[PDB]
């Protein structure tokens, strides 16, 4: 019963960061080797755990969070960082035990004329709680006068589209991100590394 990490990592379609996907990994044996053996990933940064020795530890539950963002914004997906993606799309806990993995996806997620299916939230009234999702489409009042359902000055639609083109630079090129959350709770451990 090997853990289904391939479904998250090799998925044909990835979610937008505002509507990021979470998959629970449980009651399975996890080979993290597939991840560390690979030369595929541009970012593999682990907090509270070494990239190696994950197999020797056992985790009560694992959560895999998948989204697509532009490459520079991978720097936002880290504990304690600030910015549009961290503040309004995906927030990582300060006490984060897990790994952040990212790879370039330009041939998969870019098209001539641009791919505008991937989206991000530019504005929110408050900064997001850790592991919180907002899929709202309400107009944002950045000014004193109410919007009354109409976009305008200081009244804006919350969401905008990344424009992903092959001609774009790597920082603005599409990148696929999986964040692995390892949790310790007072429960028998569903997910265990193969060694133990």
């Amino acid at each position, epitope marked *: 019963n090997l853990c289904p990490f391939g479904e998250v*990592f*090799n*998925a*044909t*379609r990835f979610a937008s960061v505002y509507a990021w996907n979470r998959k629970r990994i449980s009651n399975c044996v996890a080979d993290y080797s597939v991840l560390y053996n*690979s030369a*595929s990933f541009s970012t593999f940064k682990c907090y509270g755990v070494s990239p190696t020795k994950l197999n020797d530890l056992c985790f009560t539950n694992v959560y895999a969070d998948s989204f697509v963002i532009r490459g520079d914004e991978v720097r936002q997906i880290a504990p304690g960082q600030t910015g549009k993606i961290a503040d309004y799309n995906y927030k990582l806990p300060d006490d984060f035990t897990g790994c952040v993995i990212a*790879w*370039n*996806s330009n*041939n*998969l997620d*870019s*098209k*001539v004329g641009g*791919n505008y*299916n991937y989206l991000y939230r530019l504005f929110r009234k408050s900064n997001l709680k850790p592991f919180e999702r907002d899929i709202s489409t309400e107009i944002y009042q950045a000014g004193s006068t109410p919007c009354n359902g109409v976009e305008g000055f200081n009244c804006y639609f919350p969401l905008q589209s990344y424009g992903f083109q*092959p001609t774009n630079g790597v920082g603005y090129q599409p990148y696929r991100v999986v964040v692995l959350s390892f949790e310790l709770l007072h429960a028998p451990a569903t997910v265990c590394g193969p060694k133990k």
Partner: antibody, heavy 123, light 110 residues
């Protein structure tokens, strides 16, 4: 089983308009990309394009962009290839193929294929 | 544009023979190479993906190897069902630039 059933053979005169269909059974049509391949008489396979059904993403091959239109209907789990004006060189076999998926930074080939539709365009 | 060149264009072989067909790429396509079998009057069937991974229902006698520019498909013991035209296709690029090889015809020696 995963089955792709294409529309019957078509004979048309030059300058006419044609739409051909491939219907999918046994899989989630919305979950998998579906594309069209042309085999010219006595010739090898050519990728015309693919479409992801339900997210309105249609990606065309460089050769066929601007000459054909690829569409899909999720309600009837069907995909379509359309020629605005038929030409004699358009006469060929046309195949519908489902892309298995993606891995890492790249794509996978088509695991399931249709029976094929023969298009003959002649005076 | 990536060009896929297949050698040989044709071969004649007897049942039980080992058959080796090579696909070469203008630039590196990494692991994203696909091997197809097509028979006359019939649709193409996907034998191999990721240059070494066999599609379900494909016998072990079919095998795939190779990386970057060079790839190889091998049939360890040729079978009566295995006399057909074989194609190599690249999936590394965007779907726009996907390309097929000219193909190798495997025929019965007589």
């Amino acid at each position: 089983e995963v089955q792709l059933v294409q529309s019957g053979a078509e004979v048309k005169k030059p300058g006419e308009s044609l739409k051909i269909s491939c219907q999918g059974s046994g899989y989630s049509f919305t979950s998998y990309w579906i594309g069209w391949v042309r085999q010219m008489p006595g010739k090898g396979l050519e990728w015309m394009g693919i479409i992801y059904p339900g997210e309105s993403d249609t990606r065309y091959s460089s050769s066929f962009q601007g000459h054909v239109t690829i569409s899909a209907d999720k309600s009837i789990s069907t995909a379509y290839l359309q020629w605005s004006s038929l030409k004699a060189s358009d006469t060929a076999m046309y195949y519908c193929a489902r892309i298995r998926g993606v891995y890492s930074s790249g794509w996978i080939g088509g695991d399931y294929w249709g029976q094929g539709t023969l298009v003959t365009v002649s005076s | 544009d990536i060009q896929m060149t297949q050698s040989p264009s044709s071969l004649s072989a007897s049942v039980g023979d080992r058959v080796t067909i090579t696909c070469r790429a203008s630039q590196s396509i990494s692991s994203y190479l696909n091997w197809y079998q097509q028979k006359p009057g019939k649709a193409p069937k996907l034998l191999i993906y990721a240059a070494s991974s066999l599609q379900s229902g494909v016998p072990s006698r079919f095998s795939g190897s190779g990386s970057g520019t060079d790839f190889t498909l091998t049939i360890s013991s040729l079978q009566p069902e295995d006399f057909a035209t074989y194609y190599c296709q690249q999936s590394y690029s965007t779907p726009r630039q996907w390309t097929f090889g000219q193909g190798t015809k495997v025929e019965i020696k007589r």
